[PDB]
């Protein structure tokens, strides 16, 4: 039957993806919709193979492949807003890859994402990544100390933070890791006394 109707009543929540290797894919949005769609495909029948992909898990699945075949690669996060073609950010500064094998890298990832059309590899400056993380964390009026390293920064946040600032922190951090991933900036909300 049609997988758009084998899933729930709402069509807008999922988006089926006819991948290239005969397997069909359905793109959930979070971990409730993933357990919504991994329930259907494991309970019963679709008359072909079907496999639920997520935005925050397929991102992590590629990095299990990517750290072997490309270690010392500086990248942020892959993005599945339009899941027909993902936008895979890289560090402009910390990547010595030339434009020859970067197009090879747009073809190595397509072997992992059959649903994908072609990976849109772009470059982001590392000073812009640590900038907006700093320009938001002092915009929330939070005490911190930017410590830099060779290949990443770290914003340790300490003190006896009460509730108004402990909740402005988490909806900035979770709004940052949704945007940039967590491979260049680490937030350390380490909460102790005075």
């Amino acid at each position: 039957a049609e997988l758009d109707s084998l899933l729930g009543q709402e069509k807008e929540r999922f988006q089926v993806l006819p991948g290239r290797d005969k397997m069909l894919y359905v793109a959930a949005q979070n971990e409730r919709d993933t357990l919504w769609a991994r329930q259907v495909l494991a309970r019963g029948d679709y008359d072909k193979n079907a496999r639920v992909i997520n935005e925050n898990e397929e991102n992590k699945r590629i990095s299990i492949w990517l750290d072997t075949y490309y270690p010392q690669l500086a990248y942020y996060r892959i993005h599945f807003d339009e899941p027909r073609k993902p936008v895979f950010w890289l560090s402009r500064q910390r990547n010595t890859m030339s434009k020859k094998e970067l197009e090879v890298l747009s073809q190595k990832l397509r072997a992992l994402m059959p649903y994908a059309d072609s990976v849109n590899i772009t470059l982001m400056d590392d000073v812009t990544a640590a900038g907006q993380a700093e320009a938001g964390l002092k915009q929330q009026a939070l005490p911190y100390s930017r410590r830099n390293h060779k290949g990443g920064v770290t914003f340790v946040i300490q003190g006896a933070l009460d509730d108004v600032e402990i909740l402005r922190a988490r909806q900035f951090v979770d709004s940052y890791y949704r945007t940039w991933g967590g491979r260049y900036v680490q937030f350390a909300i380490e909460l102790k006394d005075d």
């Binding site: 357990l35 029948d45 006896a160």
Partner: protein
């Protein structure tokens, strides 16, 4: 079709189906009279449903407050037992009152129990208290934190704005959508 839970009372049975239909499997609250309710799922989802009984530890234990373990039927009820059910009724009543604020769906309130202040011969400790709160979608949660923290400050004698720990979180996405019977 396949039996999954039997002998549940009412508020335990309504909670399990709420968990199950969240995870896209339908259930059937079959009453069995005075032998409690019963929940049956279909055969392809009996596998998945018994997983979510395990992780959520369903059926839920009865929600316990402190005063259920100091009943005082005919026992002389030592002065520790009076402050035990005194503060416990205050834990419940502040919980009943936060729930009737603007937008709070549910609430939980705990009180620090400094009990042995008279037995040690010491002045008592400051009262500490914690609060949970489930708001609607769309509410700006960083500003209703001040209303609660102002409210139940003066619900006790000697507290501060540092002994009050309120961690409020907006509710989940609404489950309004039919799960679906399996295919044949």
């Amino acid at each position: 079709d396949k039996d999954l839970l039997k002998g549940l009372d009412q508020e335990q049975a309504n909670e399990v189906i709420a968990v199950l239909q969240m995870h896209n499997i339908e259930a059937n609250k079959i009453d069995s009279g005075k032998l409690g309710y019963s929940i049956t799922v279909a055969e392809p989802d009996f596998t998945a449903a018994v997983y979510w009984i395990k992780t959520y530890q369903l059926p839920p234990r009865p929600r316990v407050e402190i005063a259920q373990m100091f009943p005082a039927d005919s026992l002389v009820s030592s002065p520790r037992a009076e402050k035990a059910r005194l503060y416990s009724a205050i834990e419940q009543r502040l919980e009943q009152s936060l729930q009737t604020m603007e937008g709070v769906l549910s609430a939980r309130v705990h009180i620090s129990y400094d009990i042995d202040a008279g037995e040690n011969g010491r002045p008592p400790k400051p009262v500490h208290l914690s609060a949970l709160a489930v708001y609607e979608r769309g509410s700006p949660l960083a500003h209703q934190i001040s209303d609660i923290k102002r409210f139940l400050k003066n619900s006790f004698a000697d507290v501060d704005y540092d002994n009050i720990s309120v961690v409020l979180s907006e509710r989940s996405d609404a489950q309004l959508q039919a799960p679906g019977t399996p295919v044949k």
